[PDB]
Enzyme design. Structure first.
Site, PDB file in Angstrom:
ATOM      1  N   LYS A 128      -7.674  -7.185 -15.441  1.00 55.66           N
ATOM      2  CA  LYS A 128      -8.511  -6.643 -16.511  1.00 55.66           C
ATOM      3  C   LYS A 128      -8.552  -7.582 -17.713  1.00 55.66           C
ATOM      4  O   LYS A 128      -9.578  -7.686 -18.386  1.00 55.66           O
ATOM      5  CB  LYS A 128      -8.017  -5.250 -16.945  1.00 55.66           C
ATOM      6  N   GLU A 164       6.876 -13.667  -9.742  1.00 54.36           N
ATOM      7  CA  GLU A 164       7.206 -14.070  -8.381  1.00 54.36           C
ATOM      8  C   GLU A 164       5.944 -14.113  -7.519  1.00 54.36           C
ATOM      9  O   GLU A 164       5.077 -13.247  -7.610  1.00 54.36           O
ATOM     10  CB  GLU A 164       8.244 -13.115  -7.776  1.00 54.36           C
ATOM     11  N   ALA A 208       3.819 -13.624  -4.328  1.00 53.97           N
ATOM     12  CA  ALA A 208       3.760 -12.828  -3.106  1.00 53.97           C
ATOM     13  C   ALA A 208       2.752 -13.435  -2.141  1.00 53.97           C
ATOM     14  O   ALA A 208       1.542 -13.243  -2.330  1.00 53.97           O
ATOM     15  CB  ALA A 208       3.382 -11.387  -3.427  1.00 53.97           C
ATOM     16  N   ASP A 219       1.590   4.100 -12.414  1.00 52.96           N
ATOM     17  CA  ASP A 219       0.336   3.458 -12.012  1.00 52.96           C
ATOM     18  C   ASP A 219       0.477   2.688 -10.699  1.00 52.96           C
ATOM     19  O   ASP A 219      -0.003   1.558 -10.582  1.00 52.96           O
ATOM     20  CB  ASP A 219      -0.168   2.544 -13.151  1.00 52.96           C
ATOM     21  N   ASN A 244      -1.897  -2.815  -6.985  1.00 54.37           N
ATOM     22  CA  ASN A 244      -0.683  -3.273  -7.643  1.00 54.37           C
ATOM     23  C   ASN A 244       0.514  -3.341  -6.709  1.00 54.37           C
ATOM     24  O   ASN A 244       1.632  -3.506  -7.186  1.00 54.37           O
ATOM     25  CB  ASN A 244      -0.348  -2.344  -8.801  1.00 54.37           C
ATOM     26  N   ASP A 280       2.417  -5.109 -11.601  1.00 58.85           N
ATOM     27  CA  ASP A 280       1.883  -4.608 -12.869  1.00 58.85           C
ATOM     28  C   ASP A 280       3.002  -4.141 -13.825  1.00 58.85           C
ATOM     29  O   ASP A 280       3.629  -4.988 -14.473  1.00 58.85           O
ATOM     30  CB  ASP A 280       0.820  -3.538 -12.563  1.00 58.85           C
TER      31      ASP A 280
HETATM   32  N1  LIG Z   1       2.302 -12.461  -7.900  1.00 58.15           N
HETATM   33  C1  LIG Z   1       1.075 -12.354  -7.324  1.00 58.15           C
HETATM   34  N2  LIG Z   1       0.768 -12.979  -6.155  1.00 58.15           N
HETATM   35  C2  LIG Z   1      -0.465 -12.854  -5.597  1.00 58.15           C
HETATM   36  N3  LIG Z   1      -1.478 -12.121  -6.128  1.00 58.15           N
HETATM   37  C3  LIG Z   1      -1.301 -11.449  -7.301  1.00 58.15           C
HETATM   38  C4  LIG Z   1       0.016 -11.537  -7.972  1.00 58.15           C
HETATM   39  N4  LIG Z   1      -0.060 -10.803  -9.096  1.00 58.15           N
HETATM   40  C5  LIG Z   1      -1.318 -10.290  -9.141  1.00 58.15           C
HETATM   41  N5  LIG Z   1      -2.066 -10.667  -8.077  1.00 58.15           N
HETATM   42  C6  LIG Z   1      -3.499 -10.293  -7.851  1.00 58.15           C
HETATM   43  O1  LIG Z   1      -4.186 -10.374  -9.114  1.00 58.15           O
HETATM   44  C7  LIG Z   1      -4.674  -9.084  -9.527  1.00 58.15           C
HETATM   45  C8  LIG Z   1      -4.436  -8.791 -11.020  1.00 58.15           C
HETATM   46  O2  LIG Z   1      -3.049  -8.717 -11.374  1.00 58.15           O
HETATM   47  P1  LIG Z   1      -2.450  -7.501 -12.265  1.00 58.15           P
HETATM   48  O3  LIG Z   1      -2.766  -6.181 -11.574  1.00 58.15           O
HETATM   49  O4  LIG Z   1      -0.989  -7.819 -12.534  1.00 58.15           O
HETATM   50  O5  LIG Z   1      -3.313  -7.599 -13.643  1.00 58.15           O
HETATM   51  P2  LIG Z   1      -3.851  -6.342 -14.528  1.00 58.15           P
HETATM   52  O6  LIG Z   1      -4.010  -5.111 -13.651  1.00 58.15           O
HETATM   53  O7  LIG Z   1      -5.043  -6.843 -15.320  1.00 58.15           O
HETATM   54  O8  LIG Z   1      -2.593  -6.083 -15.537  1.00 58.15           O
HETATM   55  P3  LIG Z   1      -2.580  -5.394 -17.018  1.00 58.15           P
HETATM   56  O9  LIG Z   1      -1.999  -4.012 -16.773  1.00 58.15           O
HETATM   57  O10 LIG Z   1      -1.661  -6.302 -17.822  1.00 58.15           O
HETATM   58  O11 LIG Z   1      -4.024  -5.354 -17.497  1.00 58.15           O
HETATM   59  C9  LIG Z   1      -4.032  -8.054  -8.596  1.00 58.15           C
HETATM   60  O12 LIG Z   1      -4.895  -6.929  -8.334  1.00 58.15           O
HETATM   61  C10 LIG Z   1      -3.693  -8.870  -7.358  1.00 58.15           C
HETATM   62  O13 LIG Z   1      -4.817  -8.902  -6.472  1.00 58.15           O
HETATM   63 MG   LIG Z   2      -3.094  -4.064 -11.523  1.00 56.12          MG
END
Ligand SMILES: Nc1ncnc2c1ncn2[C@@H]1O[C@H](COP(=O)(O)OP(=O)(O)OP(=O)(O)O)[C@@H](O)[C@H]1O
Ligand SMILES: [Mg+2]
Ligand SMILES: O=C(O)c1cc(-c2cccc(F)c2)nc2ccccc12
Ligand SMILES: [Mg+2]
Length: 260
Positions: free
Chosen positions: A17, A85, A87, A130, A135, A148
């Site tokens: 996001k 980390e 994944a 969540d 996530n 997350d």
């Molecule tokens: N460590 C990782 N390795 C591989 N893919 C990842 C990893 N972390 C996140 N992703 C991918 O990137 C996307 C976004 O990451 P994340 O959900 O942490 O951000 P966000 O939801 O915007 O967090 P926030 O709550 O800070 O707004 C995930 O939906 C996933 O597909």
């Molecule tokens: Mg997320």
């Protein structure tokens, strides 16, 4: 301690996001990691600078085989950087898209690892609030890893996206505790077996009604052991939901989950 200078940036791993996650390598150790970028502009405008600091503190103090490690963090003139980390098998969300539904072995194994991680989370009195397949990442041996922690907090509390995974006490503005995670576990189990969560709708306003009423139906192929566990976790009253030890010992979990 850490600056952007110290890493080489590979390909994008996914969109969040507030920014992207990139593959990255520490220059001097050659360590492979994910490096989430968030933009300070959008973080200020949305007003989550303090909420992000709450996520970063809770997560750097957790260590569990099914929680995603946060190694560190830094910031510069325009962005914040979370060193996470890596994944290598992607998200559970993309695994659903490719396969549509999961068999009972995969589901019961994922629910075990989820419940283990949420048990440890509760021992430090942390509530995630969540868990979405978006996530949940997958480690190099296929293990499930919670990520997350953006909207996570300490019990109890009362602080966007789709309503689909939120329990009724949360969507009604009420006060919520550690059983928020038990409803979430019921929703994932359903979605893992069926391919869509039990309260999906094409509008926010109906998902509200259907969560609030707990209006959901199983299709034919869901065996009775799975109906039993799901129905026991999707209960409007939080106190009537089990604890994670009962989940880890449910006859359907034990018959289908994999061994330690
Ligand atoms: N460590 C990782 N390795 C591989 N893919 C990842 C990893 N972390 C996140 N992703 C991918 O990137 C996307 C976004 O990451 P994340 O959900 O942490 O951000 P966000 O939801 O915007 O967090 P926030 O709550 O800070 O707004 C995930 O939906 C996933 O597909
Ligand atoms: Mg997320
Ligand atoms: O005032 C700052 O320089 C600032 C720092 C951080 C920040 C730095 C470390 C960890 C963390 F979680 C957040 N986040 C921000 C988000 C928006 C606007 C400013 C900032
Ligand atoms: Mg400040």
């Amino acid at each position: 301690q850490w600056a952007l200078e110290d890493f080489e940036i590979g390909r994008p791993l996914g969109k969040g996001k507030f920014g992207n996650v990139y593959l990255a390598r520490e220059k001097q150790s050659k360590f492979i990691l994910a490096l989430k970028v968030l933009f300070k502009a959008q973080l200020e405008k949305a007003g989550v600078e303090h909420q992000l600091r709450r996520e970063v503190e809770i997560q750097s103090h957790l260590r569990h085989p099914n929680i995603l490690r946060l190694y560190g963090y830094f910031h510069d003139a325009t962005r914040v950087y979370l060193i996470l980390e890596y994944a290598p098998l992607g998200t559970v969300y993309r695994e659903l898209q490719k396969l549509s539904k999961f068999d009972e072995q995969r589901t019961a194994t994922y629910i075990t690892e989820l419940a283990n991680a949420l048990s440890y989370c509760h021992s430090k009195r942390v509530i995630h609030r969540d868990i979405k397949p978006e996530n949940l990442l997958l480690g190099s041996a296929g293990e499930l890893k919670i990520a997350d922690f953006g909207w996570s907090v300490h019990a109890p509390s009362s602080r966007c996206g789709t309503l689909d995974y939120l329990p009724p006490e949360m969507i009604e503005g009420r006060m919520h505790d550690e059983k928020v995670d038990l409803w979430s576990l019921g929703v994932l189990c359903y979605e893992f077996l069926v391919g869509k969560p039990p309260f999906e709708a094409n509008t926010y306003q109906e998902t509200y009604k259907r969560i609030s009423r707990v209006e959901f139906t199983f299709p034919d192929f869901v065996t009775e052991g799975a109906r039993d566990l799901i129905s026991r976790l999707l209960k409007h009253n939080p106190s009537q939901r089990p604890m994670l030890r009962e989940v880890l010992e449910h006859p359907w979990i034990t018959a289908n989950s994999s061994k330690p």
